[PDB]
Each structure stands twice: as structure tokens, then as C-alpha cells.
Design a protein around this ligand. Sequence first.
Ligand SMILES: [Ca+2]
Length: 272
Amino acid sequence: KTEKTVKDADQNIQDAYTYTIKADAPTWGKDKKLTAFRFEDELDKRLDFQKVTEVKAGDTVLGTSDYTVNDPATDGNKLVVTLTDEGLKKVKSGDKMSLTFEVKRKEVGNTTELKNRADVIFNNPNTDKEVKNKTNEVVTYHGKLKVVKKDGKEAGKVLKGAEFELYQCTSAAVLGKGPLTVDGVKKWTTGDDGTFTIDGLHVTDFEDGKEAAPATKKFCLKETKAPAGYALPDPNVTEIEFTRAKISEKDKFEGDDEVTLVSEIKNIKQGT
Ligand SMILES: [Ca+2]
């Protein structure tokens, strides 16, 4: 069957991840040859194609002379991987074709979901007819994380200058991997409105194209520096339940839209 898979677990915005397209080549006798075979994939506009990592015909790993790659940036983000005449010679009747390529998601954009589907288009050597087989659709979800720094007492007082790191964690008491780099940044500071937004993070409840198995996967914000005149909170680690359903909630805080999770973190004035 014609199948698409995505390997994206824990890959945030601007982290490389991969798609794989698998399809059966047609069958043909010794008196014929495969005259055309290509993969096509309309990449979501939020993706930046990086490179093809592998093209295989059965167990044969193809080389760059065996296929051509277009430039998705100049073809409306459509990727086309076409077997050359040398590449078509390496294809055996009924071979399982495979294409793996790498992308980066540039931003969350207007939906947490980012879908992908592909087509395999070839000439059937038995009839010389063009055949087009579409894959299933796979989905990758990312959301924005907005942090709003406030004074624990004085309601409505937002605080500039608070500094934070981000970690993977099982809980706020047990930090995992980090400080994480997200789109070249590994430390964020609250601005004049007491906020910053991390655009963006991989959701925890869905990964590699399917629902995640029940697990205690979370993100944690570590406040490393409090605003001037404020004591560093204890605890200074805030855990975030960064799921599709939690992100989708809206109008609970300023800037709380369906693609952003808003986390309000309190600080007590130095000397209480
Ligand atoms: Ca929201």
C-alpha cells in the first residue's frame, strides 16, 4: 500500500524532523523496464524542506545520480523526487520504494495541526498508462507557549525582566532534557507587557502521526532571574500540560487563542 509516516517526537519549531513515503513499484517482465517513477509532496507552507535523506528500491539505497530533487521554495513548496534513467535501472519488479526527507517547521502559524500527504506517480510498464497512488495523511501538532509574569499581590501588575529556561520534564520536581534551544533561543525574557511567547513547541499528547501512549511527558519553565525588586520564587519551576486540548482552550487570559497556551507565573516583591 501507499503510505506516509512522520517522525517528529520532541522536535519543536525549527528542529529537523522527517517524513517517509513508502509505495510498491509496479511489476513487469524481463522484456520491459520501468520508464517513469516519482514522488510528489505538497508541503505545508510553514515547512522549510531541508534535504532528501534516503531513496530506496527494495534494499538498494539509491545515490543522488539515481533521482532528481526540485526546489520546493520555487515550486509553491511542492517537493518532487524523480527517478532518473540510471535510478529506474536499479528498480526491480514490485520493489518496495521508500523516500525519507527532512523538514523544519518555521512556526506554529494559524493552526496547531500541520498535515502532510504525498503521491507516487509512475508509468505502468504493462499498459504504458500513468498511475497515481496517494498516501494517507499524517499530522504534526505544535503550539505557542506564552508566559505572563505578574506580581503575586498587586493584581494587573505585569513584570518585565524575568528570565526563563525551558526543559522537558516528568514533573516540576524532576527536570529532564534542557535548557532546550527553540529556534536559536535557550533563554527568554518578559518584555514591557510582562510576556514572551515561545513559537513553538511540539504537543505532548500526539507524536509520530498518532496519539501518544499514556505517559507523564511535560514541559517545565525554570525561572532563572526574577524582575528587579522581586525575589526568585520557590519553587522556580512551573510544569506545563502542553496538550492539543489544553492549547485549544481560549479567552481565559489575554492572548489566549486556540494555538497558544498562556502560563501566568507570580513573583513576590523582594523583602515581601
Ligand atoms: Ca489557548
